[PDB]
Amino acid sequence: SRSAKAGLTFPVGRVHRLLRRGNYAQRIGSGAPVYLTAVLEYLAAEILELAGNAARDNKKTRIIPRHLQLAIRNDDELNKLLG
Amino acid sequence: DSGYVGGLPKNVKEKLLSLKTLQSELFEVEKEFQVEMFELENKFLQKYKPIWEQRSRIISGQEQPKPEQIAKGQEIVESLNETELLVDEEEKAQNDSEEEQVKGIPSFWLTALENLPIVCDTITDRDAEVLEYLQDIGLEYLTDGRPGFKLLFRFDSSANPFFTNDILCKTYFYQKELGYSGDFIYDHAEGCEISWKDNAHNVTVDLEMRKQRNKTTKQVRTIEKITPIESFFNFFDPPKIQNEDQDEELEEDLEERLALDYSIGEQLKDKLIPRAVDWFTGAAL
Amino acid sequence: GYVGGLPKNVKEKLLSLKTLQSELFEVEKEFQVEMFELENKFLQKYKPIWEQRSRIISGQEQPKPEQIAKGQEIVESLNETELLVDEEEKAQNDSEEEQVKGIPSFWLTALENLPIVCDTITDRDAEVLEYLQDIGLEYLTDGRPGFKLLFRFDSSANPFFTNDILCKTYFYQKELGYSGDFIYDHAEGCEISWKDNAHNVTVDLEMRKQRNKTTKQVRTIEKITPIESFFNFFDPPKIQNEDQDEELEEDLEERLALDYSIGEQLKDKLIPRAVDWFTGAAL
Amino acid sequence: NELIIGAQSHTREVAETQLLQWCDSDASQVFKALANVALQHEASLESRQFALLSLRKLITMSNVEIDVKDFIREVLLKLCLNDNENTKIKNGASYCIVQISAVDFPDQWPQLLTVIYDAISHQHSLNAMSLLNEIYDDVVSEEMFFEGGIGLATMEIVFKVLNTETSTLIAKIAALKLLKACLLQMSSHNEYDEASRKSFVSQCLATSLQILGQLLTLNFGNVDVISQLKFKSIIYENLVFIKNDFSRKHFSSELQKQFKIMAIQDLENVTHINAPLLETVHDCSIYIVEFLTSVCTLQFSVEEMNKIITSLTILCQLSSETREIWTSDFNTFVSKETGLAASYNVRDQANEFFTSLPNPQLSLIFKVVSNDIEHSTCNYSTLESLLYLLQCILLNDDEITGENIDQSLQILIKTLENILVSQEIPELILARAILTIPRVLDKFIDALPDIKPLTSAFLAKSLNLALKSDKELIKSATLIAFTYYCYFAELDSVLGPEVCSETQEKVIRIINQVSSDAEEDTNGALMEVLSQVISYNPKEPHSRKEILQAEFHLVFTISSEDPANVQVVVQSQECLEKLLDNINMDNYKNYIELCLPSFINVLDSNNANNYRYSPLLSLVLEFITVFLKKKPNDGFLPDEINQYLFEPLAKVLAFSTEDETLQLATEAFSYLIFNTDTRAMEPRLMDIMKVLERLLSLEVSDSAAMNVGPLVVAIFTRFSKEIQPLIGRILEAVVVRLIKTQNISTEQNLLSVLCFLTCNDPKQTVDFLSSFQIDNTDALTLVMRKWIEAFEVIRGEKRIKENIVALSNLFFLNDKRLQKVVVNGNLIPYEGDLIITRSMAKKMPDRYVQVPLYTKIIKLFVSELSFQSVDDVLDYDKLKEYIDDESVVQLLVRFFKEVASKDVSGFHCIYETLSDSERKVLSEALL
Amino acid sequence: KETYSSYIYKVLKQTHPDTGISQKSMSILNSFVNDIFERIATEASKLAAYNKKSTISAREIQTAVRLILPGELAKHAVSEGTRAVTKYSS
């Protein structure tokens, strides 16, 4: 798979299909969806690491919406980015 | 246990041979069972054809829902959870002239296919461009000739700019004998030659052009190149075998491509079309 | 979502599609009925072959030279040359051959070769299974659709229980489970009339003769404690779901998954394929 | 004791917060002490109040107190219901009960709820009905009201209380308050046709209307006037709520008629009262007039109009308190008359009532009011109220008409004239006449021949009265009357140009006077009036600079008092743009001296403040720019503009340290430098360099820095031949800023500046970048590297082309340094497929490889060609021979062709290191 | 509805093998991912339409990320995007 080829776990196919349905441009460079999926997975991994940090702040190994919100609170820049 | 097998008395070995003969008889009975199932399944495909055609007309906009079917759909919606279909006041204010500007369900079959787990992975955007013109997906059982089932894909020549074929169909074939488990086993598949309007619109190949005053041959020559590429439309023109190359190269070809091709065909035939509406809306997941 | 947000033309078209879906569901119900009719028709043809092989296994019937020749040809075509007869085996006299009427541990060996069920067999179960003669299958016609399983034991010589035949029943839900198949419903089974607790292979036994230290009475005790076994296939999970069984319902759901897997294995592989599984060629 | 005293002693607050945060057995101990304090209602009042407060706060919230919680709950029920309990203790118990219902028992707490229910039904404990009212306010739900059955039971209790005439009047008050609560909850379910809820609504409304019909027919002699007034008030508030919210079917028209008759009689009675009583009278009259407004559709009888008019005259007359407040400070009068005041009183409700009548009733009211004001002319006491009623009638947007309207209107006009003329007339009556004359003329703009002469006469008379009399209230009233006149008609046409100019001068003088002590809202009103004056300012040759400069100075003085006033600032924008909208050539040299010096005053004033943000300051910067652009300015701007503006703008840019002022001043200063004569600008070109040096320095935000680039473009465009010695300063400042700034747009703009310098002279720019150093390294090392990095993300075909040209010049120049300088960017991903976070990247960042600038730019251009987009033969110098035989793509292809022609010495060496894919891109681009 | 379930679990386990997440927080994370995609894709479309190129390339995505994300976040997102493109381009 393309995600496997780039080492990504998130599906480049979903990102490419979202771009297509959005029709953000008359053509999309093949590297563009890979780059976008990589960025999205980077932000997801950041949020998940902070969620693990929050669950540990909660003395638990299971992430829940409370832990996710606390994780967003923990990181100021991501706090402003996500809001 | 080979030692135990040797330990069996000659009489018990004869009994085991008779039991194996009984198993073979059961195999022939299973063959007749499968024949009867195929015949009655064909009958029920005939029975399904009217409803499938009617929903296809609804999808394409050729037909408009009647108030009775509308009420039946509403009461079905009240069952389970489909309140998405409950028409609100804002929509009733609309007029058919404004609504009918878009006729049919846009990208109904494209969405239905892309919602299907195994098959959607093969559909590239270039393939999806043709799928926009897909308005029908039909089933046909090869009662005549070699056993198998044929998938039908329909398009409009006057609309699509890719090929002049109104219908593209894929074929699957089974062996003359049943499988060990009693289910059908597969034979080499075949696909149609897509009548591309031009090679540029062709989606299964990538082309290059160059023109050189090649001094190596004293030729002012123009050259063209064609390279097959991965695409869902490679689902057609399935692999075929040449003995000498079959033994070395196409052994892995049959190991890999045939498995995926058969899995995709079975998934389509079983999951998709019987639940085309649910698959389009995703409820069939 | 947005398809609903689209004008009411799309909503009404989808409503008509749902009506056609309900009509197709009715047609599919009638289709399932026809499939069950034909399945029972061909199960009537299956039953004679299964009964004949059961008679052969138990020794109640003998093969014939034509059957032996056909089996020889089929084995030669199969490449399973282990079953072939040899002159040394032919030297065996009739007296030596007739010392056993049926195939020793035929069903036991076949179940042992089977992937999952063999794990459930204990040594005492293996001893009991030697008395297992036939395995029969049936379809449930009335009420909830389903299929029934049967085992035959030579109760006359069986020292463990008096049950001549044990039957296991399976049930399906009322309507069509999605995807056009049936989903399981809870199962029911019979109770084994064990001759005694010592012979009860579903139980481990303790014998105690005591003089009570409190009341100084004299008593002899026969004690019981259930154990796992192949006959735990019977006494199946009680109910699909009930208020009083929830704590039980946990294990009931787990054992339901396991028992439905076992029953599907039986139905698909063992009863239709018994010779190869006994010989191990089906592996 | 210690438990109570420590909690209620800094030990008091420490112990209170300690209690609240505990949620612990320790809380159960202090909570036990407080509960025992609460139980002993015979003593410890203050500690009981403190305990109630703490319990209320605690309940909002670990539940060890639960054992003692229920005890105090059962005690608190009694504490609330026992009327002998203290008032504040009772209220504490009640809202604590409400809070407990909210948290613990949103559904009925059966003991408390049933006990209070029964107590209300039987014993009629008023505190209980108050508790129920707040309960409905806070914790009940409409579904609970309808289907929970609470609504029906409550309504039955209330109906029983109202039916039992033995119930005291205060009990009636409580019952009616709870009935309002019940109707508020009921109307919340506007989704009628719900069979149960619809039937409940119908029965409840029918019974309520019947009972309220019964209640009003009652009479109570003179037992208690305050209670009677509250009783009538709540009854009529009920009736108004029903008439407004519920369907016309529920509240039938016959009931409307009878309630209307009874409401007129109640107006009579309430006015006869007064033989805080007055405030209760005003409230009851507010609600009665609301009801009359709602039922206004019905017919009205002559005696009924007489009663309504006389009662409203008595009610609407100003209380001495309001008259004193207005006379002491005209600001309050301006606020109230302009509608900015928030208070709502009987007079506003009378305004609502009169405006809503239909044409026949409205005509009859107008006739009655004219007849009454004719007689009341001698009776000055009621005159202002009747004038206000006339104003409300005329403010009704409908055709006042009728048989005798002409004669009554003549009489009314004569009365207004006499009111104006009389010198002994009271102040407020004169003000109301002034404000009412415009309405009288407006609604009779037709059917009143000689309207133009009468408008002229009245406007002149009112302006003269405002000027001569020195009562500021009258001045503000006359300004508002002028504002109303402007809407009524085109004063210039009716007045004529000369009279219009005279009135403009007079209104300007009035504004100059009253503006001395205006309030902020008064300032807004004055700004609106001035806007009205400006419109009539003739742009015809008759325009006079006296009026124009007076208007400008007024605009600036009014706003300067309260710069932070945003509303005044925006109205000043409107007035100022209307001023500048004039077009006349010779006078746009007079504007330089006329308006511009006023701006300099604003800039100087903020100077002491260091030009911190102020909406007026932004306004003046905006309109300096707009004035400079609006001026013909096809040739150079007149030199006078430079002399005024340059120094204030230079100071603003040098000292200010906030984004908005710097941006606006920067754009204005850029325009000034761009459009002015270069010769006159030449001697002071040094000052601009001081300004530029200050902005490029980090002491200002990057928001200012990015705008610098266009300013440098302007400087170099105007002064291409004097700039040369100053280039070094500009280049060094911009380079030191660029390497330190990290904002994308800022560095993009600074790189645009560098490209502009290189295009001006590549050798010079290279030399300065080599000589200048930051952190003791050649700027080219940092500058070229960062430039290339930024070029990867530059946007816009214009900037891309500029980058291409600049890099082409760099490549052609072929100095040693441009060759040796190696750039960062050639990437290899870090090992592993794991997703690198910031914490991860701190130890495992991705890796890059370096190449000489020429190779890097070749790779970048090849990539750009790729994006915009046997031929694979190597030795591309021969491919050029085969190939040889304004957009980015065209110019860049031409660049590559020229490079292959000239730079073969280095380009061929670079090509050899080039990859095959890049070579393929080069080949396909050459097509 | 958006579903990145199995891949969210994979990322979490790679970051923390002993840590799990509940499906509701997973849906919220999908919402965050969709919002990020929407902003990046929208502004990248802005850049593509701005240029005559009329194409959303990896350059458009990189510029959109740089404009959207803060300094460190933008730098790291760009780093991993280029990493993925280089790995894919092999």
PDB file of C-alpha atoms in Angstrom, chain B residues 5-6 8-27 29-30 32-33 36-37 40-41 44 47-48 51-52 54-55 58-59 61 63-65 69-70 72-74 76-77 82 84-88 91-92 94-95 99-100 102 104-105 108 180-182 274-275 277-278 280-281 283-284, chain C residues 1 3-4 6-9 11-25 27-28 30-31 34-35 38-39 42 45-46 49-50 52-53 56-57 61-63 67-68 70-72 74-75 78 80 82-86 89-90 92 97 100-101 103-104 106 178-180 272-276 278-279 281-282:
ATOM      1  CA  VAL B   5      -1.900 -47.120   9.306  1.00  0.00           C
ATOM      2  CA  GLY B   6       0.353 -50.107   8.702  1.00  0.00           C
ATOM      3  CA  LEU B   8      -4.641 -51.712  10.362  1.00  0.00           C
ATOM      4  CA  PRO B   9      -5.724 -55.243   9.345  1.00  0.00           C
ATOM      5  CA  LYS B  10      -6.288 -55.958   5.663  1.00  0.00           C
ATOM      6  CA  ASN B  11     -10.036 -56.219   6.290  1.00  0.00           C
ATOM      7  CA  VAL B  12     -10.089 -52.788   7.937  1.00  0.00           C
ATOM      8  CA  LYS B  13      -8.109 -51.397   4.998  1.00  0.00           C
ATOM      9  CA  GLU B  14     -10.792 -52.787   2.679  1.00  0.00           C
ATOM     10  CA  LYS B  15     -13.430 -51.133   4.864  1.00  0.00           C
ATOM     11  CA  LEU B  16     -11.558 -47.821   4.658  1.00  0.00           C
ATOM     12  CA  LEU B  17     -11.409 -48.127   0.866  1.00  0.00           C
ATOM     13  CA  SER B  18     -15.175 -48.686   0.802  1.00  0.00           C
ATOM     14  CA  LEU B  19     -15.623 -45.634   3.034  1.00  0.00           C
ATOM     15  CA  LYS B  20     -13.509 -43.564   0.631  1.00  0.00           C
ATOM     16  CA  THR B  21     -15.745 -44.744  -2.212  1.00  0.00           C
ATOM     17  CA  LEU B  22     -18.740 -43.594  -0.159  1.00  0.00           C
ATOM     18  CA  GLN B  23     -17.019 -40.223   0.248  1.00  0.00           C
ATOM     19  CA  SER B  24     -16.649 -39.980  -3.531  1.00  0.00           C
ATOM     20  CA  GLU B  25     -20.357 -40.763  -3.913  1.00  0.00           C
ATOM     21  CA  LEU B  26     -21.031 -37.937  -1.461  1.00  0.00           C
ATOM     22  CA  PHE B  27     -18.895 -35.745  -3.726  1.00  0.00           C
ATOM     23  CA  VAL B  29     -24.186 -35.791  -4.550  1.00  0.00           C
ATOM     24  CA  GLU B  30     -22.577 -32.448  -3.677  1.00  0.00           C
ATOM     25  CA  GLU B  32     -25.845 -32.287  -7.966  1.00  0.00           C
ATOM     26  CA  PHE B  33     -26.553 -30.104  -4.917  1.00  0.00           C
ATOM     27  CA  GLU B  36     -29.596 -27.266  -8.140  1.00  0.00           C
ATOM     28  CA  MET B  37     -28.401 -24.279  -6.104  1.00  0.00           C
ATOM     29  CA  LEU B  40     -32.473 -21.744  -8.346  1.00  0.00           C
ATOM     30  CA  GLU B  41     -30.045 -18.863  -7.754  1.00  0.00           C
ATOM     31  CA  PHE B  44     -33.905 -15.687  -8.007  1.00  0.00           C
ATOM     32  CA  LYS B  47     -36.753 -12.374  -9.566  1.00  0.00           C
ATOM     33  CA  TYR B  48     -34.380  -9.651  -8.322  1.00  0.00           C
ATOM     34  CA  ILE B  51     -36.320  -4.324  -8.228  1.00  0.00           C
ATOM     35  CA  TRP B  52     -32.703  -3.738  -9.246  1.00  0.00           C
ATOM     36  CA  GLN B  54     -36.329   0.106 -10.636  1.00  0.00           C
ATOM     37  CA  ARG B  55     -33.722   1.284  -8.132  1.00  0.00           C
ATOM     38  CA  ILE B  58     -34.381   5.966  -9.368  1.00  0.00           C
ATOM     39  CA  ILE B  59     -30.603   6.402  -9.140  1.00  0.00           C
ATOM     40  CA  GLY B  61     -33.379  10.005 -12.264  1.00  0.00           C
ATOM     41  CA  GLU B  63     -38.108   7.670 -12.640  1.00  0.00           C
ATOM     42  CA  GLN B  64     -39.610   9.699  -9.800  1.00  0.00           C
ATOM     43  CA  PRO B  65     -40.792   8.208  -6.480  1.00  0.00           C
ATOM     44  CA  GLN B  69     -43.421   4.227  -2.095  1.00  0.00           C
ATOM     45  CA  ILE B  70     -42.543   7.502  -0.362  1.00  0.00           C
ATOM     46  CA  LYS B  72     -43.379   3.071   2.679  1.00  0.00           C
ATOM     47  CA  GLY B  73     -39.845   4.456   2.762  1.00  0.00           C
ATOM     48  CA  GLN B  74     -40.873   6.847   5.528  1.00  0.00           C
ATOM     49  CA  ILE B  76     -39.214   1.986   7.050  1.00  0.00           C
ATOM     50  CA  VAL B  77     -37.197   5.013   8.192  1.00  0.00           C
ATOM     51  CA  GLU B  82     -32.780   6.406   9.044  1.00  0.00           C
ATOM     52  CA  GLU B  84     -31.755  11.289   7.493  1.00  0.00           C
ATOM     53  CA  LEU B  85     -34.437  10.506   4.897  1.00  0.00           C
ATOM     54  CA  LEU B  86     -37.244  12.298   6.760  1.00  0.00           C
ATOM     55  CA  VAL B  87     -38.002  15.335   4.600  1.00  0.00           C
ATOM     56  CA  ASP B  88     -37.959  18.638   6.475  1.00  0.00           C
ATOM     57  CA  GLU B  91     -37.060  21.080   1.417  1.00  0.00           C
ATOM     58  CA  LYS B  92     -40.819  20.998   0.786  1.00  0.00           C
ATOM     59  CA  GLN B  94     -38.291  23.769  -2.937  1.00  0.00           C
ATOM     60  CA  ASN B  95     -39.622  23.232  -6.458  1.00  0.00           C
ATOM     61  CA  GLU B  99     -34.258  20.241  -7.710  1.00  0.00           C
ATOM     62  CA  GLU B 100     -34.345  18.541 -11.121  1.00  0.00           C
ATOM     63  CA  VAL B 102     -29.392  17.676 -11.005  1.00  0.00           C
ATOM     64  CA  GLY B 104     -30.214  11.182 -10.551  1.00  0.00           C
ATOM     65  CA  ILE B 105     -27.887  10.432  -7.651  1.00  0.00           C
ATOM     66  CA  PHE B 108     -23.912   6.685  -6.596  1.00  0.00           C
ATOM     67  CA  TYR B 180     -12.563 -30.297  -1.788  1.00  0.00           C
ATOM     68  CA  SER B 181     -14.793 -28.513   0.739  1.00  0.00           C
ATOM     69  CA  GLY B 182     -17.739 -28.805  -1.667  1.00  0.00           C
ATOM     70  CA  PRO B 274     -27.751  -7.052  -3.065  1.00  0.00           C
ATOM     71  CA  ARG B 275     -27.136  -4.173  -0.615  1.00  0.00           C
ATOM     72  CA  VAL B 277     -28.343   1.240  -1.266  1.00  0.00           C
ATOM     73  CA  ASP B 278     -26.874   0.368   2.133  1.00  0.00           C
ATOM     74  CA  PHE B 280     -23.877   3.632  -0.987  1.00  0.00           C
ATOM     75  CA  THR B 281     -25.019   5.095   2.335  1.00  0.00           C
ATOM     76  CA  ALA B 283     -25.147   1.093   6.301  1.00  0.00           C
ATOM     77  CA  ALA B 284     -23.979  -2.221   4.813  1.00  0.00           C
TER      78      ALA B 284
ATOM     79  CA  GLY C   1     -25.309  13.022   5.868  1.00  0.00           C
ATOM     80  CA  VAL C   3     -27.189  13.280   0.951  1.00  0.00           C
ATOM     81  CA  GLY C   4     -29.953  14.047   3.423  1.00  0.00           C
ATOM     82  CA  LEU C   6     -29.475  17.550  -0.448  1.00  0.00           C
ATOM     83  CA  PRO C   7     -32.865  18.698  -1.803  1.00  0.00           C
ATOM     84  CA  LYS C   8     -35.937  16.565  -1.125  1.00  0.00           C
ATOM     85  CA  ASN C   9     -35.593  14.943  -4.556  1.00  0.00           C
ATOM     86  CA  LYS C  11     -34.470  12.198   0.035  1.00  0.00           C
ATOM     87  CA  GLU C  12     -37.557  10.886  -1.761  1.00  0.00           C
ATOM     88  CA  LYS C  13     -35.439   8.817  -4.149  1.00  0.00           C
ATOM     89  CA  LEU C  14     -33.662   7.255  -1.165  1.00  0.00           C
ATOM     90  CA  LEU C  15     -37.038   6.602   0.475  1.00  0.00           C
ATOM     91  CA  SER C  16     -38.096   4.720  -2.656  1.00  0.00           C
ATOM     92  CA  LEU C  17     -34.776   2.861  -2.539  1.00  0.00           C
ATOM     93  CA  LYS C  18     -35.512   1.818   1.053  1.00  0.00           C
ATOM     94  CA  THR C  19     -38.975   0.616   0.023  1.00  0.00           C
ATOM     95  CA  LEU C  20     -37.358  -1.445  -2.735  1.00  0.00           C
ATOM     96  CA  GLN C  21     -34.889  -2.699  -0.117  1.00  0.00           C
ATOM     97  CA  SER C  22     -37.775  -3.937   2.035  1.00  0.00           C
ATOM     98  CA  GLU C  23     -39.314  -5.653  -0.997  1.00  0.00           C
ATOM     99  CA  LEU C  24     -35.936  -7.237  -1.764  1.00  0.00           C
ATOM    100  CA  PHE C  25     -35.778  -8.379   1.867  1.00  0.00           C
ATOM    101  CA  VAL C  27     -37.867 -11.783  -1.750  1.00  0.00           C
ATOM    102  CA  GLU C  28     -34.725 -12.765   0.170  1.00  0.00           C
ATOM    103  CA  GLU C  30     -38.598 -16.470   0.332  1.00  0.00           C
ATOM    104  CA  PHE C  31     -35.165 -17.232  -1.149  1.00  0.00           C
ATOM    105  CA  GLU C  34     -36.357 -22.195  -0.875  1.00  0.00           C
ATOM    106  CA  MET C  35     -32.700 -22.747   0.036  1.00  0.00           C
ATOM    107  CA  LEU C  38     -33.523 -27.755  -1.173  1.00  0.00           C
ATOM    108  CA  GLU C  39     -30.973 -28.206   1.627  1.00  0.00           C
ATOM    109  CA  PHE C  42     -30.309 -33.059  -0.316  1.00  0.00           C
ATOM    110  CA  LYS C  45     -29.782 -37.934   0.227  1.00  0.00           C
ATOM    111  CA  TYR C  46     -26.808 -37.332   2.533  1.00  0.00           C
ATOM    112  CA  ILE C  49     -24.445 -42.444   3.002  1.00  0.00           C
ATOM    113  CA  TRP C  50     -23.654 -41.279   6.534  1.00  0.00           C
ATOM    114  CA  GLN C  52     -23.998 -46.665   5.746  1.00  0.00           C
ATOM    115  CA  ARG C  53     -20.532 -45.496   6.762  1.00  0.00           C
ATOM    116  CA  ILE C  56     -19.373 -49.974   8.429  1.00  0.00           C
ATOM    117  CA  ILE C  57     -17.559 -48.231  11.292  1.00  0.00           C
ATOM    118  CA  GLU C  61     -22.249 -54.131   7.879  1.00  0.00           C
ATOM    119  CA  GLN C  62     -19.463 -55.417   5.640  1.00  0.00           C
ATOM    120  CA  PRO C  63     -17.943 -53.916   2.460  1.00  0.00           C
ATOM    121  CA  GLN C  67     -16.576 -51.064  -3.307  1.00  0.00           C
ATOM    122  CA  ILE C  68     -13.058 -52.178  -2.367  1.00  0.00           C
ATOM    123  CA  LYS C  70     -13.438 -48.536  -6.438  1.00  0.00           C
ATOM    124  CA  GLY C  71     -11.742 -47.371  -3.245  1.00  0.00           C
ATOM    125  CA  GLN C  72      -8.455 -48.815  -4.490  1.00  0.00           C
ATOM    126  CA  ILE C  74      -9.747 -43.670  -5.833  1.00  0.00           C
ATOM    127  CA  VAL C  75      -6.786 -44.024  -3.458  1.00  0.00           C
ATOM    128  CA  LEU C  78      -5.483 -39.567  -4.676  1.00  0.00           C
ATOM    129  CA  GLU C  80      -2.600 -41.641  -0.513  1.00  0.00           C
ATOM    130  CA  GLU C  82      -0.751 -45.612   2.749  1.00  0.00           C
ATOM    131  CA  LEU C  83      -4.126 -47.387   2.553  1.00  0.00           C
ATOM    132  CA  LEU C  84      -2.804 -49.862  -0.033  1.00  0.00           C
ATOM    133  CA  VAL C  85      -2.902 -53.545   0.906  1.00  0.00           C
ATOM    134  CA  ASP C  86       0.299 -55.582   1.178  1.00  0.00           C
ATOM    135  CA  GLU C  89      -1.355 -57.996   5.598  1.00  0.00           C
ATOM    136  CA  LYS C  90      -3.036 -60.531   3.305  1.00  0.00           C
ATOM    137  CA  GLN C  92      -3.567 -62.484   8.233  1.00  0.00           C
ATOM    138  CA  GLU C  97      -9.281 -60.259  11.282  1.00  0.00           C
ATOM    139  CA  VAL C 100     -12.711 -56.762  16.032  1.00  0.00           C
ATOM    140  CA  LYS C 101     -15.972 -56.085  14.204  1.00  0.00           C
ATOM    141  CA  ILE C 103     -12.840 -50.033  13.162  1.00  0.00           C
ATOM    142  CA  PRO C 104     -11.039 -49.543  16.509  1.00  0.00           C
ATOM    143  CA  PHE C 106     -12.576 -44.708  14.281  1.00  0.00           C
ATOM    144  CA  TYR C 178     -27.852  -8.835   7.784  1.00  0.00           C
ATOM    145  CA  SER C 179     -25.682  -9.903   4.820  1.00  0.00           C
ATOM    146  CA  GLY C 180     -28.344 -12.481   3.889  1.00  0.00           C
ATOM    147  CA  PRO C 272     -19.431 -34.692   5.293  1.00  0.00           C
ATOM    148  CA  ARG C 273     -15.743 -35.729   5.515  1.00  0.00           C
ATOM    149  CA  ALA C 274     -15.054 -38.594   7.939  1.00  0.00           C
ATOM    150  CA  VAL C 275     -12.722 -40.965   6.082  1.00  0.00           C
ATOM    151  CA  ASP C 276      -9.943 -38.461   5.395  1.00  0.00           C
ATOM    152  CA  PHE C 278      -9.826 -40.447  10.408  1.00  0.00           C
ATOM    153  CA  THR C 279      -6.876 -41.264   8.147  1.00  0.00           C
ATOM    154  CA  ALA C 281      -5.317 -37.002   4.867  1.00  0.00           C
ATOM    155  CA  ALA C 282      -7.760 -34.133   5.441  1.00  0.00           C
TER     156      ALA C 282
END
